[PDB]
Amino acid sequence: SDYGFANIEEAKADAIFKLNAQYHQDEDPKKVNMSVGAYRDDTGKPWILPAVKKASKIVEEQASFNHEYLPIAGLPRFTKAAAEVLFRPNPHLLSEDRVASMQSVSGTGANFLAASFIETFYVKHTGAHVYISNPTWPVHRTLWEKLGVTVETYPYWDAKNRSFDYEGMLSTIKSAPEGSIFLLHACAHNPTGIDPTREQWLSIFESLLSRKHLVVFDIAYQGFASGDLNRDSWALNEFVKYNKDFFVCQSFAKNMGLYGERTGCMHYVAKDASTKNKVLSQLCIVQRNTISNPPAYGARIAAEILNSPQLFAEWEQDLKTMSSRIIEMRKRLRDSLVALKTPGSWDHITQQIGMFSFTGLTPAQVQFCQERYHLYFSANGRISMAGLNNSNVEHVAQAFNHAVRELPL
Amino acid sequence: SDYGFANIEEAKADAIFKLNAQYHQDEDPKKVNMSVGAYRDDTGKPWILPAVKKASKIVEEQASFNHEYLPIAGLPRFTKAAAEVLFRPNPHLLSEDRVASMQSVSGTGANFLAASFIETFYVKHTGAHVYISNPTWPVHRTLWEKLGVTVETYPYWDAKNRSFDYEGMLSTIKSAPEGSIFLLHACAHNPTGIDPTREQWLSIFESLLSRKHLVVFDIAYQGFASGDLNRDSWALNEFVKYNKDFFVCQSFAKNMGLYGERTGCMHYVAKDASTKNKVLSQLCIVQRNTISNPPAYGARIAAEILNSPQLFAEWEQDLKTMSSRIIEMRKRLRDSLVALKTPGSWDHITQQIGMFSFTGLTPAQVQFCQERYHLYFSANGRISMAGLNNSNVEHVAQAFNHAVRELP
């Protein structure tokens, strides 16, 4: 202001933040927030996983417990265990010392690490662009653009068929310049919820390799999506068979409910230990000059679970609890729309997976739901299934039924 | 590697890391780690502050405790109280809604936030360089250079007088281009430990004001340094009188022992609420595109202490415990060097404050201390007092005495 800062333009309101403001001002007792991006139980409350609560109690009583700095790359028994749970069918990647793992400030910080590294050591001399799904998590675009990488998209949501636009994605893969960067969702695509089949994945991998593209997997919902850890990491482990180095950005925010503790890991899967160590040393330079070292509390908890056979088994029970409740809400919503004979097909509701769903509603229909049924969710029709429970799912189905019947497109 | 990554050259190890590796390989029973980057108690061990142990139990036993996402700018009860403890003499800054406060990944993350914002909204319009003390924490230079700002230095360590180079710093402030960026240490200068006196600060501020420089304060040791929170933030609050907007990067790593939980805050002290809100909205964009939101555990602990009068009083006792122990070690070391009649003057050991000290030892004397007395510290003579205690301080004094006498 003695320095020109009053000339700055104040930034536009965050998308999620402005919806939340409107939800909170609504005075109707039947209102529902269907934009919450975190798991909720059947009463609509945050839910601490019993295994996580148990692990944090165990950790706090340990004689060695303290608040001292971690190594720059993070807590070693966390980074090692985080890689192991991704690659249970491929333990040789760890034992051959081929995975460079950096504990990160959750999934977003892992993406920031990978993108910073890839921009400096790949984009600089190749001019490659990064390709993200259309639609995707909106930070995927701005995070990469802020680091100076040009962002392109590949088609993903086929709105007419309410399904995955396999042919559009494949066509973009084949026509993109060789050696482009492709940001892939490992499972439970955000925001649509619809994943490629295994058959579609194999064809996707074939074309990615034929064009020599560089692959970055984002895996934010392993185990949380299906309750089965190896099923949810299937695409990652299938890609290992092709013997191309690649990157993985991993979050424990949802599958351990650690959200605000910021527990994640970035991995580079090298072809040999020598390159693993070259890359790791450069990743440490980025880490040193952004955060210095990562937060310990969530990592200690995750390492405790992952390295204990009994806590691991109890965590898998908690994953089953969460994934089953979402599946049950998807079934309830779809079953009510079928019973109400709502125009259109509604099987995409149960063919999708994870806590986000592209419903297929239009902006007019979403606005109708907001004004007449006090449902708050995104204009593109994305809902969070976590907001749905036994007390409101019939109200939600009735709203959708009315909106679609009243406002056909 | 199918992508050219085998052509990357492996970065060389950090000097501190390589030093610690050498310390732990040394089998000599009298070895001392003089490079510990964190507080240690009188027995050489990590030390959880009693108030922090109490605060964390209170936090986790609270009925509403959970692990949910914080807002982009962090836990409001933390960021408000983090500003309050900096500006206790100046409560009008908060009541007029003039402080934009962003919870960060400790002091490093606060610095990254401040530097990213200043590069984007100040440096690219003015061409300003940032001036850091010579010496300073080495990440200050690389953090700013990585973001595209040219880094200059101002003189700080007077090696011949073993003191603060006031005239050199003042001369650089006066000759730097108008509108330059100056990174200042609020108290307990890292790595020398020597601070400007209050009268030197007043003259420093006048010259900064007359050249219209932009000021960024780093405050990583408030309360930890002297045991007195308001004394340690005196320079911050004195600068408030000059009515220029400015930045503060705050860390709770040392003063709450929260090191690995990564608890800190960046503040922009605006002239008015309008610009405060403009800057804050741009800070949130940077934060959204790097970490999304900051880690909750340490911030909840800090907010519990800072918002409770009784816990705050307990924490102030822990601050007295830590600062007193470091002062006593400095006194023990200084008094032994005086009694050993070690050539040179050693009052700088007790005129410095905080955990880090420039000893004045030469590289050959430091190397002598490592090989003959198994003391591990930096070749510029910087030591950490945290590793000193009753079991080894006399060994350290005798090493310095021998090193200085043998290598004049």
Author numbering:
A (entry chain A): 2 to 410
B (entry chain B): 2 to 409
Show sentences the authors wrote.
AST generally forms a homodimer consisting of two active sites in the vicinity of subunit interfaces; these active sites bind to its cofactor PLP and substrate independently. Each subunit is composed of three parts: large domain, small domain, and N-terminal arm. The active site is situated in the cavity formed by two large domains and one small domain.
In this study, to suggest a broader view of the three-dimensional structure and show the structural features of PLP-family proteins, we determined the crystal structure of AST from Schizosaccharomyces pombe. The structure of SpAST forms a very stable homodimer with an unusually extended interface. Each subunit of SpAST folds up into three spatially and functionally distinct regions: a large domain, a small domain, and the N-terminal arm. Unexpectedly, two additional electron densities were found at the active site and the surface that could be fitted to phosphate and glycerol molecules. A clear density that could be fitted in most likely a phosphate was found in the active site of SpAST. Interestingly, the phosphate was located in the corresponding position of the phosphate moiety of PLP. The phosphate moiety interacts with the main chain of Gly108 and Thr109 and the side chain of Arg263 and Tyr70. Notably, the electron densities of Arg289 and Lys255 in SpAST were somewhat poor, but unambiguously, the positions of Arg289 and Lys255 side chains were located away from the cofactor or inhibitor from SpAST. This was presumably owing to the absence of its substrate or inhibitor.
